[PDB]
Design a binder for this molecule. Structure first.
Ligand SMILES: Cc1cc2nc3c(=O)[nH]c(=O)nc-3n(C[C@H](O)[C@H](O)[C@H](O)COP(=O)(O)O)c2cc1C
Ligand SMILES: CN(Cc1cccnc1)c1ccc(NC(=O)C2CC2)c(C(=O)O)c1
Ligand SMILES: CCCCCCCCCCC[N+](C)(C)[O-]
Ligand SMILES: O=C1C[C@@H](C(=O)O)NC(=O)N1
Length: 363
């Protein structure tokens, strides 16, 4: 439970296991509840009301750690204020050949090209149904569940893949994410283009609206950090035109920022962690401005401290997520981020997280 011991423990495990093996093991341990339950108790300062729900704290686990919905309860126990699973594809698929995940310890970064390895909708559906009422109580308790939807590699109709995801997992989710920003599926990111995006999201929203009221999720779009100014303007325009409920900003980057030191920096894939942090923050800042602060943003990318979280909140994020920091600092990082965030909010005169959202734009 000690942040300092994990930040001896983690260096040792990483020296024993390749990152995918470590990941699979972490999912197993988490799902089994082997893990101190977090000591940090959330104060009222951290509560956020957005997307039609209460979040007891603004720090969630990003998509990709629990791709198949196996460790949801263990993740709440870790102290996350909300959990997002996925991406899930309609049919099962294996993803790319291994190795497909790489550590850049000198950069506190990871590169991955998993390629949407997924148990598929049916498996995940039954897995979530088995704990559906437990989740209903968690959500009511301020601990919401998100489901992130992807598309199969060999799919002929991308929009239909997402539509299927809405119909099958929408009823089980507090929010859905249309993931159009994975760098690891050919042609996927072009769905971020204005015409493709409008057509895709119109279909997604129609399917969502066709679900019964108590089973009707918010719909968010998750975007890349690598968008042109034109891409961002167009996404903002479509989001407001269609009434999209929120944005997740951002996925991993295909860029390789000057200064990366890791030996594996030239591996193909999406880069996450520290080198992504400010690129993500600036994308949040831009999208918040383009949407006039009217569209909830979940900020993601390189968060490993309370300062990192608050910078994204002040840039316009209502909630934040992290993943990569977990691989370097381990479970203690969740409470660390929350404790540091609370201290910083007090220091800077905010009554709570809600007061800080978008604060940079009012200065
Ligand atoms: C190993 C790995 C797998 C990921 N898988 C997904 C995914 O399946 N769907 C998705 O929307 N994002 C996925 N992501 C992106 C993360 O959700 C997040 O947007 C990105 O890693 C930036 O946050 P971070 O720096 O805290 O890790 C993945 C990231 C990593 C490191
Ligand atoms: C040890 N740990 C944190 C943890 C989380 C939940 C329960 N116990 C411990 C963890 C989890 C996932 C990891 N791998 C990855 O996720 C990589 C990106 C594929 C790593 C790693 O690569 O070193 C370490
Ligand atoms: C039929 C299912 C095909 C996809 C298998 C996916 C296995 C996922 C194992 C845990 C997640 N991880 C990313 C670490 O592989
Ligand atoms: O959305 C995604 C998909 C994931 C993968 O390759 O499965 N890799 C990522 O970095 N982001």
């Amino acid at each position: 439970g000690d942040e300092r011991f994990y930040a001896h423990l983690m260096p040792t495990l990483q020296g024993l296991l390749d990152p995918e093996s470590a990941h699979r093991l972490a999912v197993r341990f988490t799902s089994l509840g082997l893990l101190p339950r977090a000591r940090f108790q959330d104060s009222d300062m951290l509560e956020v009301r957005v997307l039609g729900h209460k979040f007891r704290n603004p720090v969630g686990i990003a998509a990709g750690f629990d791709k198949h919905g196996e460790a949801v309860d263990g993740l709440y126990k870790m102290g996350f204020g909300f959990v997002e699973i996925g991406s899930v594809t309609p049919k099962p698929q294996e993803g790319n050949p291994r190795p497909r995940v790489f550590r850049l310890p000198e950069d506190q970064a990871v590169i991955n090209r998993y390629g949407f390895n997924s148990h598929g909708l049916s498996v995940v559906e039954h897995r979530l149904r088995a704990r559906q009422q437990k989740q209903a109580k968690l959500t009511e308790d301020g601990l919401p569940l998100g489901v992130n939807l992807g598309k199969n590699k060999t799919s002929v109709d991308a929009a239909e893949d997402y539509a299927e995801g809405v119909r099958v997992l929408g009823p089980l989710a507090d929010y859905l994410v249309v993931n159009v920003s994975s760098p690891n599926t050919a042609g996927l990111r072009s769905l971020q283009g204005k015409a493709e995006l409008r057509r895709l999201l119109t279909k997604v929203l129609q399917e969502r609206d066709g679900l019964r009221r108590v089973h009707r999720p918010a719909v968010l779009v998750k975007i890349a950090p690598d968008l042109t100014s034109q891409d961002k303007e167009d996404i903002a325009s479509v989001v407001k035109e269609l009434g999209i409920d929120g944005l997740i900003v951002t996925n991993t980057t295909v860029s390789r920022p000057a200064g990366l030191q890791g030996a594996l920096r030239s591996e193909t894939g999406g880069l996450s962690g520290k080198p992504l942090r400010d690129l993500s923050t600036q994308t949040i800042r831009e999208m918040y401005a383009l949407t006039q602060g009217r569209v909830p943003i979940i900020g993601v990318g390189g968060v490993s401290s309370g300062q990192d979280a608050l910078e994204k909140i002040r840039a316009g994020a209502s909630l934040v997520q992290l993943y990569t920091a977990l691989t370097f600092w381990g479970p203690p990082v969740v409470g660390k981020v929350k404790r540091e965030l609370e201290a910083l909010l007090k220091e800077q005169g905010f009554g709570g997280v809600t007061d800080a959202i978008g604060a940079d734009h009012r200065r």
